[PDB]
Amino acid sequence: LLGIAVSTDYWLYLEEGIILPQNQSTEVKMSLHSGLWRVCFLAGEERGRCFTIEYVMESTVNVLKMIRSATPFPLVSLFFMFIGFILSNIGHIRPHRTILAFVSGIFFILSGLSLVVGLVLYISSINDEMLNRTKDAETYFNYKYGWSFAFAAISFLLTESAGVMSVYLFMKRYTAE
Amino acid sequence: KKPQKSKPGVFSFLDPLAYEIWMCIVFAYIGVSVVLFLVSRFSPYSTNEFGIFNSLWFSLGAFMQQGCDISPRSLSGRIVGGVWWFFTLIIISSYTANLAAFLTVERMVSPIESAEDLSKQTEIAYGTLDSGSTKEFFRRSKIAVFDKMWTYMRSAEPSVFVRTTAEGVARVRKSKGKYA
Amino acid sequence: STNEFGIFNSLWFSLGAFMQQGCDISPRSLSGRIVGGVWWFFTLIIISSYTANLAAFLTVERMVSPIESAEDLSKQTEIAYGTLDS
Amino acid sequence: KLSEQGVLDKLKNKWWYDKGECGAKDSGSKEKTSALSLSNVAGVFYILV
Numbered sequence: 001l002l003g004i005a006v007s008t009d010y011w012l013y014l015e016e017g018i019i020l021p022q023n024q025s026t027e028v029k030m031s032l033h034s035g036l037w038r039v040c041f042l043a044g045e046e047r048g049r050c051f052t053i054e055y056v057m058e059s060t061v062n063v064l065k066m067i068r069s070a071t072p073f074p075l076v077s078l079f080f081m082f083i084g085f086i087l088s089n090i091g092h093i094r095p096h097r098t099i100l101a102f103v104s105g106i107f108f109i110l111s112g113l114s115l116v117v118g119l120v121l122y123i124s125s126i127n128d129e130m131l132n133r134t135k136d137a138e139t140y141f142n143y144k145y146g147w148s149f150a151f152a153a154i155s156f157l158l159t160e161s162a163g164v165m166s167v168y169l170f171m172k173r174y175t176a177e
Numbered sequence: 178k179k180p181q182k183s184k185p186g187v188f189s190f191l192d193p194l195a196y197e198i199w200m201c202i203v204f205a206y207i208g209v210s211v212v213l214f215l216v217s218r219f220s221p222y223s224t225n226e227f228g229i230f231n232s233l234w235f236s237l238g239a240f241m242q243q244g245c246d247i248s249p250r251s252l253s254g255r256i257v258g259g260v261w262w263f264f265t266l267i268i269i270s271s272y273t274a275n276l277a278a279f280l281t282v283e284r285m286v287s288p289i290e291s292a293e294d295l296s297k298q299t300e301i302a303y304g305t306l307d308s309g310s311t312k313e314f315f316r317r318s319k320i321a322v323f324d325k326m327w328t329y330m331r332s333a334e335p336s337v338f339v340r341t342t343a344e345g346v347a348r349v350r351k352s353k354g355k356y357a
Numbered sequence: 358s359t360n361e362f363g364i365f366n367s368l369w370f371s372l373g374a375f376m377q378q379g380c381d382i383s384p385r386s387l388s389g390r391i392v393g394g395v396w397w398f399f400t401l402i403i404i405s406s407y408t409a410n411l412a413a414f415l416t417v418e419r420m421v422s423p424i425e426s427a428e429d430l431s432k433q434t435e436i437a438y439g440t441l442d443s
Numbered sequence: 444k445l446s447e448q449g450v451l452d453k454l455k456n457k458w459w460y461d462k463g464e465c466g467a468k469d470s471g472s473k474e475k476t477s478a479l480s481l482s483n484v485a486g487v488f489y490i491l492v
């Protein structure tokens with residue numbers, strides 16, 4: 001679930017537009033979706049053009065720099081689950097030497113805690129970038145999350161649950177020995 | 178640039194109370210826990226429930242509004258437990274009431290208000306137009322404040338000077354309050 | 358039977374109930390639970406009245422604004438202003 | 444000529460401010476903050492001691 005999330009780029013939906021007064025109608029000027037490394041315009045130049053964050057061109061740029069800033073912490077979380085996944089399976093191959101389940105439980109718990117401070121720093125870095133811009137009566141600005149953000153949240157709950165269940169498999173096996 | 182709502186700091190939650198109050202709360206926390214351990218020791222009234230490690234946990238529970246498992250059973254202990262309960266009732270009520278003042282009434286302050294403040298700081302850069310009587314005023318000025326401002330504007334990298342008036346206004350709007 | 362509520366316990370129970378810090382022991386008789394419960398309703402209103410009235414003081418004190426122009430003198434009439442006679 | 448060489452500005456600074464008894468009074472007008480201090484809650488500590 002995390003590997004789909006880090007690879008894909010459907011994280012943030014940003015829309016900017018200008019209203020038409022006395023008619024109760026709104027007309028967009030730009031729309032895009034972004035990820036940790038790849039940006040593709042849904043309605044930018046009314047075209048599906050795709051640039052990386054390094055290939056720049058206002059506030060939409062400044063949001064994109066903060067998404068690149070919050071990069072490392074999901075990569076740390078995937079690295080610790082991959083170590084925890086290997087030690088879990090080789091413990092299933094060899095039921096003796098019961099220490100393999102307990103150490104793998106620690107890598108799962110440290111994975112989820114790294115994912116939380118990833119999301120907290122991500123959401124904070126997005127919120128203040130909407131805050132600094134000057135308000136106008138004729139301009140509306142919106143934001144929305146994506147399905148890759150939903151997968152990372154689900155990836156937290158299953159990783160914490162497997163880290164709990166690995167401790168019980170340690171205790172029940174050590175009691176049987 | 179006009180002062181606006183800014184990015185809140187990471188430690189902005191401890192803004193309604195001053196820093197001298199927060200250090201006195203810590204110092205009073207240690208002082209009560211030492212007193213509660215000592216007086217319970219030489220005055221017993223069986224098992225010494227209130228140790229130095231237990232007394233820190235008792236006073237921490239009373240400040241954080243939670244209940245504690247053990248209670249003092251002597252007269253001298255219950256006076257210490259009684260007064261420390263009254264202390265935390267006022268402070269937590271003072272923290273709640275001051276946040277209601279901040280969130281209701283918004284007052285914003287400008288960093289600078291005079292030319293002598295700009296000379297005594299290096300956070301905000303300041304510049305003039307390149308050709309005109311404005312730059313010529315700072316050039317031949319024998320006033321001590323204005324002479325200090327010319328030494329900064331001359332030896333500044335990147336150049337604070339602009340070409341036109343509209344370019345100078347555009348740098349003010351886009352530097353997030355770092356250019357005057 | 359085996360009751361514990363002496364006068365030293367009863368002053369200690371009422372002091373803990375007002376400060377909302379809990380109690381070691383609770384009344385088990387029905388007449389004891391009546392006198393306990395009404396004192397709980399007393400301390401709930403008094404503490405909530407203290408926090409709300411303190412927030413009333415600090416908000417009104419924050420809204421007090423000084424005079425910084427002649428326009429602010431014009432609309433406001435607790436301060437009197439005058440000039441020289443000739 | 445005296446206006447453009449700042450000699451009028453030089454005389455004004457000397458007579459108004461340098462002979463001023465309220466020495467550097469403009470610095471005191473800057474500071475302003477709003478929070479609870481020790482003076483507001485001093486009596487609670489006196490009950491504690």
Ligand SMILES: O=c1[nH]c2cc(C(F)(F)F)c(N3CCOCC3)cc2n(CP(=O)(O)O)c1=O
Nearest residue numbers: 306307308309310311312313314341342343345
């Ligand atoms: O006689 C003069 N009268 C001037 C009047 C004005 C204006 F304020 F627009 F009326 C200005 N500007 C100030 C701001 O930038 C745009 C033009 C320059 C003037 N200058 C050039 P100086 O040498 O810089 O004083 C003169 O010489």
